[PDB]
């Protein structure tokens, strides 16, 4: 219950130990804008020709990081030692344009509900492992502090071929999605 | 070139576990009248949180108690600012000239690959494209001249 | 109050090398900086270094600088190539906007 | 960069009246303005600051202001006193750009002699 005509998300910064595992990404009407390679610590387009002009200058990306980083070590010992409620994901699966048996299209599977956000989402073709032409997204944000998520698929539509969506988590053991309607 | 801006993670001196932080911007007109949430997450609790109507660090937890006078006492001033610094800066000098003018028009009735939201159930696709599922056919979007048909 | 810097007159035999060392104390201002003035009055920033042992090296006309923050409260810098003089002053601050305390400077005069 | 440049290079005034230093900077991002005062090669002691939320502060007989979309400000000290008599250097940085904010950009310097 908080509303208004747009939002921004100029914070996101998720990070969780052990392991120690980073994002920082920017939304805008539940798009995320960019995200900052905290490796290669630079800042990385959703959109490649979205910062034509404008400019994310990545340092701040990765103090947010180190922030939470720190803010965990002093937040752990402060609720005793409780760890993380490993909630089950909840994919589902369609396509980009309506199905044109020829030309190319994209298939995508959308998980929700993940928590904490490491996952994998891998796609099948007939139950052979496919590697190509995929794109993921980073983890979104949810209002209750879930993630969601997006895995892409670039595939020419021939019937006969079937496609499969693996989404191998933990508080699941797979879960596959065949499409639907 | 035009920067977008960041809202700042504020620090605190002293079996998985996940820490969050969210930086809320919200808008009304753009403009007039704006709000600002940053909230400071321990697991799925939001334990610590200032709002720009309360213009100081709360907590909503137990969780923060020995944070919110911590950041008061070190981040108040310039957080408070946050609001015109960064919310403000990034609605005017950075979404206008990309992600509100840019829009992209559509394509048992589904239609395909429209921005923005407003038409006339509903997917994010979240590659910046839309999808609906309702049950001639009239769809009428703000993108257009003549609201597409057939 | 704030910070102790060491030394604070000091000649560099040309070009060679020569160092210093600013002591926090005080954790409420934990974020060190280094500033340089030149010798016409004029402050450059060269080094924020927050963690320990983060460390770096800026060329600079005319020094050339090695800054280190080895502790949790003290911060280095060595300094060399030292062409006019300058003086040096290290600071700190308890956050990103928010003003930076002065130290009390380390004067370098080139002696040829 | 941030150029951020003192007009003026030098003020007289003598006691009670009011001193005034002026100041622009080029970035659009630049959020907050500290200024600092040297007397006599000693160190730079803080003096007084301002965001830019604000257009104006003042505080006892120091007042400074900001015209954001003129990308101006100035720090008006007031009441003059033979002690007041230093170095006074504005400066900037984006409290909201990671790239710069742990960094301040001074300008050149004013001198500022207050006569008895």
């Known amino acids: 219950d908080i509303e208004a005509d747009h939002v921004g998300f100029y914070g996101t910064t998720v990070y969780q130990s052990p392991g120690d595992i980073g994002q920082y990404t920017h939304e805008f009407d539940g798009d995320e804008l960019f995200y900052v390679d905290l490796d290669k610590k630079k800042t990385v387009w959703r959109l490649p020709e979205f910062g034509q002009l404008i400019l994310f200058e990545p340092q701040g990306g990765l103090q947010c990081i180190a922030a939470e980083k720190h803010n965990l070590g002093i937040l752990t010992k402060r609720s005793n030692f409780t760890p993380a409620t490993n909630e089950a994901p909840q994919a589902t699966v369609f396509p980009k344009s309506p199905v044109l048996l020829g030309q190319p299209n994209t298939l995508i599977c959308f998980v929700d509900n993940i928590f904490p956000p490491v996952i994998n989402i891998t796609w099948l073709r007939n139950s052979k492992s496919v590697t190509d032409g995929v794109y993921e997204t980073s983890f979104l944000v949810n209002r209750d502090h879930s993630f969601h998520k997006l895995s892409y698929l670039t595939f020419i539509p021939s019937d006969d071929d079937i496609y499969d969506c693996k989404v191998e988590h933990w508080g699941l053991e797979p879960v596959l999605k065949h499409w639907e309607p | 070139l035009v920067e977008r801006l960041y809202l700042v993670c504020g620090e605190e001196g002293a079996r998985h576990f996940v820490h969050q932080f969210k930086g809320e911007c919200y808008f009304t007109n753009g403009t007039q009248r704006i709000r600002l949430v940053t909230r400071y997450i321990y697991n799925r609790e939001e334990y610590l949180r200032f709002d720009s109507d309360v213009g100081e660090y709360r907590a909503v937890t137990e969780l923060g108690r020995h944070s919110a006078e911590y950041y008061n006492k070190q981040y108040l001033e310039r957080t408070r600012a946050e609001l015109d610094t960064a919310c403000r800066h990034n609605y005017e000098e950075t979404e206008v000239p990309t992600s509100l003018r840019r829009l992209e028009q559509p394509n048992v009735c589904s239609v395909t690959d429209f921005y923005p939201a407003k038409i006339k159930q509903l997917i994010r696709n979240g590659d910046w494209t839309f999808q609906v599922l309702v049950m001639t056919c009239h769809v009428e979007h703000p993108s257009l001249k003549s609201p597409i048909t057939v | 109050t704030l910070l102790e810097q060491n030394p604070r007159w000091r000649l560099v035999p040309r070009g060679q090398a020569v160092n210093l060392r600013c002591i926090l104390k005080?954790?409420?201002?934990?974020?060190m900086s280094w500033y340089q003035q030149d010798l016409q009055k004029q402050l450059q920033w060269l080094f924020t270094?927050?963690?320990?042992?983060?460390?770096?090296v800026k060329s600079l006309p005319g020094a050339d600088y090695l800054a280190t923050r080895v502790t949790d409260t003290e911060l280095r810098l060595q300094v060399a190539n030292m062409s006019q003089g300058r003086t040096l002053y290290c600071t700190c601050?308890?956050?990103?906007?928010?003003?930076?305390?002065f130290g009390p400077g380390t004067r370098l005069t080139v002696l040829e | 960069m941030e150029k951020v440049e003192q007009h003026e290079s030098t003020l007289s005034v003598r006691e009670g009246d009011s001193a005034v230093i002026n100041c622009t900077y080029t970035?659009?991002?630049?959020?907050?303005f500290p200024w600092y005062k040297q007397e006599a090669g000693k160190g730079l002691h803080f003096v007084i600051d301002?965001?830019?939320?604000?257009d104006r502060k003042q505080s006892q007989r120091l007042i400074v202001l900001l015209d954001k979309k003129a990308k101006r400000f100035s720090l008006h000290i007031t009441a003059t006193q033979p002690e007041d008599s230093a170095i006074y250097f504005c400066?900037?940085?984006?409290?909201?750009?990671?790239?710069?904010?742990?960094?301040?950009?001074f300008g050149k310097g004013t001198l500022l002699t207050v006569t008895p």
């Open positions: 270094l927050r963690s320990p042992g983060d460390a770096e």
């Open positions: 301002i965001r830019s939320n604000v």
């Open positions: 601050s308890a956050g990103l906007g928010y003003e930076q305390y």
């Open positions: 005080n954790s409420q201002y934990p974020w």
């Open positions: 970035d659009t991002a630049s959020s907050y």
């Open positions: 400066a900037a940085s984006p409290s909201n750009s990671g790239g710069s904010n742990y960094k301040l950009t």
